[PDB]
Amino acid sequence: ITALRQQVETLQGQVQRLQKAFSQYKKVELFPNGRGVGEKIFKTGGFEKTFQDAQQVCTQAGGQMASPRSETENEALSQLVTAQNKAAFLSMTDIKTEGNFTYPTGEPLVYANWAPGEPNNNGGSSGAENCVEIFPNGKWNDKACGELRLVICEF
Amino acid sequence: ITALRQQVETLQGQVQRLQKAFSQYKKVELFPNGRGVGEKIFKTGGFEKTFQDAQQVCTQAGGQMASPRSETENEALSQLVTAQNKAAFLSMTDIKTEGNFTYPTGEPLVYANWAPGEPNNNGGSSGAENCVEIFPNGKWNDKACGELRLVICEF
Amino acid sequence: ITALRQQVETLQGQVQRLQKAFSQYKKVELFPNGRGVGEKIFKTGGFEKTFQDAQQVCTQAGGQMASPRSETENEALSQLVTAQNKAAFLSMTDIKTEGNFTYPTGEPLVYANWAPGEPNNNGGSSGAENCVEIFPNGKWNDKACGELRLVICEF
Numbered sequence: 001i002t003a004l005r006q007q008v009e010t011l012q013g014q015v016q017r018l019q020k021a022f023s024q025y026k027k028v029e030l031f032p033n034g035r036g037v038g039e040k041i042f043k044t045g046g047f048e049k050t051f052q053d054a055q056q057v058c059t060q061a062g063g064q065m066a067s068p069r070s071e072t073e074n075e076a077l078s079q080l081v082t083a084q085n086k087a088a089f090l091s092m093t094d095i096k097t098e099g100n101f102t103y104p105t106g107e108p109l110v111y112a113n114w115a116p117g118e119p120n121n122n123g124g125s126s127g128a129e130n131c132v133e134i135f136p137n138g139k140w141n142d143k144a145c146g147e148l149r150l151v152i153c154e155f
Numbered sequence: 156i157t158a159l160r161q162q163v164e165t166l167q168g169q170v171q172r173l174q175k176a177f178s179q180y181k182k183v184e185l186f187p188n189g190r191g192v193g194e195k196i197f198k199t200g201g202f203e204k205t206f207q208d209a210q211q212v213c214t215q216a217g218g219q220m221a222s223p224r225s226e227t228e229n230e231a232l233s234q235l236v237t238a239q240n241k242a243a244f245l246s247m248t249d250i251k252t253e254g255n256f257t258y259p260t261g262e263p264l265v266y267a268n269w270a271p272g273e274p275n276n277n278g279g280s281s282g283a284e285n286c287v288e289i290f291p292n293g294k295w296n297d298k299a300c301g302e303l304r305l306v307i308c309e310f
Numbered sequence: 311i312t313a314l315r316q317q318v319e320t321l322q323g324q325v326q327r328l329q330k331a332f333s334q335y336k337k338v339e340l341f342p343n344g345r346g347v348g349e350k351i352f353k354t355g356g357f358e359k360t361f362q363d364a365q366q367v368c369t370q371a372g373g374q375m376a377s378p379r380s381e382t383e384n385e386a387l388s389q390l391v392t393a394q395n396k397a398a399f400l401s402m403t404d405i406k407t408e409g410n411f412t413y414p415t416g417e418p419l420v421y422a423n424w425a426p427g428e429p430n431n432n433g434g435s436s437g438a439e440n441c442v443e444i445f446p447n448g449k450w451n452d453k454a455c456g457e458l459r460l461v462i463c464e465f
């Protein structure tokens with residue numbers, strides 16, 4: 001019928017405009033504290049928290065902590081850390097089994113970028129190191145979970 | 156007709172993807188300076204202003220100052236204030252009638268969370284207190300409108 | 311057919327809600343570091359960079375540096391600069407031909423708002439001035455490109 005065809009065409013135009021406007025506002029949103037990789041979005045709050053508090057903040061916000069599963073994802077995190085000039089906590093811990101770092105689902109690492117000599121589980125006055133921080137250069141260091149580091153969430 | 160049915164199906168897929176992407180970017184946007192409650196969105200600019208300047212900033216931005224009409228809305232504001240560690244101005248004033256706080260539409264309060272002893276209209280050197288600040292604990296204190304407090308806007 | 315008509319009506323409702331939600335999240339996004347003018351969106355990162363670094367940051371983010379082509383666009387930039395209280399770099403340089411400022415496409419200025427006495431190409435210890443900064447009052451001053459100024463990107 002002629003009426004619905006005109007309706008479909010109008011909808012087609014509205015959808016196209018929504019898509020154009022959404023791509024623009026996606027880039028506006030991510031500037032400068034976010035990075036998109038595939039269907040994942042990394043964003044920093046610009047503040048520092050302990051691992052447990054960061055875990056609460058990310059969950060509360062409807063997301064989770066960053067789990068870099070590829071060089072592309074890790075490099076995206078590196079950019080955020082570099083911009084804030086503050087090392088960030090990742091999602092992974094070896095809390096269940098020492099030396100065995102896993103995602104918050106128990107799954108073993110599919111990607112790793114340990115700095116030379118890490119993980120060493122030597123946090124000095126803070127004690128054992130069961131969490132992971134990412135440096136501006138993208139490299140990882142195991143770090144005490146009670147330490148304060150940049151919060152990056154994953155949505 | 157077969158042509159338009161295929162068009163509707165394609166539109167259905169585009170809309171579904173837009174909805175999925177929009178829910179994700181809603182949470183990305185609100186992290187960490189925004190809170191959604193029903194159809195209302197609270198967001199802080201991270202800066203402090205006098206009541207009048209805050210009123211101008213929120214209006215200019217296409218919104219208004221925060222009018223917590225329920226415990227849920229008030230608690231959302233509490234989280235933002237807690238995160239910034241800065242008490243924020245609300246929208247309500249008793250400027251027309253002393254002791255009678257109203258929304259910027261003249262409507263009386265449907266919800267209130269006054270701290271013990273408030274409102275007292277005693278601002279010391281600033282004079283009368285005709286505006287309202289919200290504490291990290293969610294409680295309210297009547298405050299001089301010329302004082303500087305965190306700006307939270309409502310959209 | 312009755313089935314597709316109901317589908318079109320449902321799509322109509324979904325699109326309308328998407329549009330309503332998108333206008334709200336557009337204003338939420340732009341508060342307080344963005345300004346919309348026509349189909350262009352200006353946003354500041356809140357940080358300072360040299361012209362070349364700012365050019366890299368904006369490009370990386372999927373946009374470009376601000377090219378105010380009208381009083382409306384320039385005034386929007388003025389508001390962002392005023393809010394951050396930091397003068398920002400614009401996109402234009404006279405690097406190809408001295409005294410002739412052009413957009414990063416070689417096109418001559420369609421709009422200009424030089425402060426009295428500018429451009430003068432006198433940056434003192436920094437040397438020649440081949441870039442442009444915008445003041446809180448909206449006026450322009452030619453500035454050395456190696457100086458650090460507020461980064462505003464255009465999307």
Ligand SMILES: *[C@@H]1O[C@H](CO)[C@@H](O[C@@H]2O[C@H](CO)[C@@H](O[C@@H]3O[C@H](CO[C@H]4O[C@H](CO)[C@@H](O)[C@H](O)[C@@H]4O[C@@H]4O[C@H](CO)[C@@H](O)[C@H](O)[C@H]4NC(C)=O)[C@@H](O)[C@H](O[C@H]4O[C@H](CO)[C@@H](O)[C@H](O)[C@@H]4O[C@@H]4O[C@H](CO)[C@@H](O)[C@H](O)[C@H]4NC(C)=O)[C@@H]3O)[C@H](O)[C@H]2NC(C)=O)[C@H](O)[C@H]1NC(C)=O
Nearest residue numbers: 093094096097098099100101102103105106107108109110
């Ligand atoms: C740290 O602690 C971690 C937590 O315990 C632990 O993680 C575990 O790591 C192992 C080894 O990598 C891993 O096993 C692999 O799992 C792969 C994914 O599929 C899972 O899950 C799906 C369902 O989601 C199942 O359908 C799969 O069968 C498999 O089930 C797992 O099976 C094992 C027993 O076989 C159970 O113990 C797990 O509980 C169970 N997991 C789940 C979630 O159910 C899978 O693709 C891998 O397959 C390889 O091994 C199979 C035999 O196990 C072969 O049949 C298959 O062909 C694969 O062979 C590999 O092929 C390569 C070439 O292509 C060779 O180079 C490899 O050598 C060869 N590997 C082997 C072992 O033969 C594999 O099963 C567990 O999933 C994981 N556990 C959890 C809970 O995630 C770590 O080991 C600890 N150490 C470190 C350093 O991280």
Ligand SMILES: *[C@@H]1O[C@H](CO)[C@@H](O[C@@H]2O[C@H](CO)[C@@H](O[C@@H]3O[C@H](CO[C@H]4O[C@H](CO)[C@@H](O)[C@H](O)[C@@H]4O[C@@H]4O[C@H](CO)[C@@H](O)[C@H](O)[C@H]4NC(C)=O)[C@@H](O)[C@H](O[C@H]4O[C@H](CO)[C@@H](O)[C@H](O)[C@@H]4O[C@@H]4O[C@H](CO)[C@@H](O)[C@H](O)[C@H]4NC(C)=O)[C@@H]3O)[C@H](O)[C@H]2NC(C)=O)[C@H](O)[C@H]1NC(C)=O
Nearest residue numbers: 248249251252253254255256257258260261262263264265
């Ligand atoms: C501070 O200063 C404020 C500004 O002046 C002032 O705000 C006023 O507060 C009163 C009392 O709460 C409030 O009156 C209530 O209004 C309710 C909302 O409906 C309004 O508006 C709609 C249109 O939008 C009309 O259709 C309604 O009729 C009503 O109109 C109002 O009517 C009054 C006169 O009756 C006028 O003076 C107002 O100008 C006018 N407002 C507008 C915008 O037009 C309404 O639901 C409430 O209804 C109750 O009272 C009615 C009689 O007035 C009853 O018929 C009805 O059944 C309700 O009875 C209540 O029922 C409860 C149980 O269910 C009982 O427990 C209650 O005891 C009982 N209440 C009463 C009073 O009987 C009611 O009308 C005004 O709307 C509001 N004015 C403005 C401008 O917003 C405050 O009083 C000042 N003090 C404080 C402490 O805040």
Ligand SMILES: *[C@@H]1O[C@H](CO)[C@@H](O[C@@H]2O[C@H](CO)[C@@H](O[C@@H]3O[C@H](CO[C@H]4O[C@H](CO)[C@@H](O)[C@H](O)[C@@H]4O[C@@H]4O[C@H](CO)[C@@H](O)[C@H](O)[C@H]4NC(C)=O)[C@@H](O)[C@H](O[C@H]4O[C@H](CO)[C@@H](O)[C@H](O)[C@@H]4O[C@@H]4O[C@H](CO)[C@@H](O)[C@H](O)[C@H]4NC(C)=O)[C@@H]3O)[C@H](O)[C@H]2NC(C)=O)[C@H](O)[C@H]1NC(C)=O
Nearest residue numbers: 403404406407408409410411412413415416417418419420
């Ligand atoms: C700084 O350095 C800059 C870089 O070299 C330089 O920028 C150049 O500025 C000139 C003068 O303003 C400008 O010329 C104008 O271009 C207008 C836009 O159209 C362009 O491009 C389109 C395609 O995109 C073509 O279709 C047009 O023909 C025109 O092509 C240009 O043509 C000139 C030669 O004519 C070439 O040198 C350019 O390379 C070429 N550009 C491109 C991209 O291809 C155009 O609308 C303007 O038209 C006016 O002049 C025409 C004759 O050239 C007339 O036919 C037409 O009627 C217009 O007349 C004007 O009318 C007004 C009243 O309505 C009068 O008041 C004006 O006096 C009258 N102007 C003139 C000159 O007669 C015009 O062509 C160049 O486009 C631009 N170059 C580049 C690369 O961008 C600056 O001059 C330097 N100085 C300063 C201070 O900025």
Ligand SMILES: [Ca+2]
Nearest residue numbers: 094121129130
């Ligand atoms: Ca450890």
Ligand SMILES: [Ca+2]
Nearest residue numbers: 120121141142
């Ligand atoms: Ca270590």
Ligand SMILES: [Ca+2]
Nearest residue numbers: 249276284285
């Ligand atoms: Ca008062």
Ligand SMILES: [Ca+2]
Nearest residue numbers: 275276296297
């Ligand atoms: Ca008080």
Ligand SMILES: [Ca+2]
Nearest residue numbers: 404431439440
């Ligand atoms: Ca120059």
Ligand SMILES: [Ca+2]
Nearest residue numbers: 430431451452
């Ligand atoms: Ca100058």
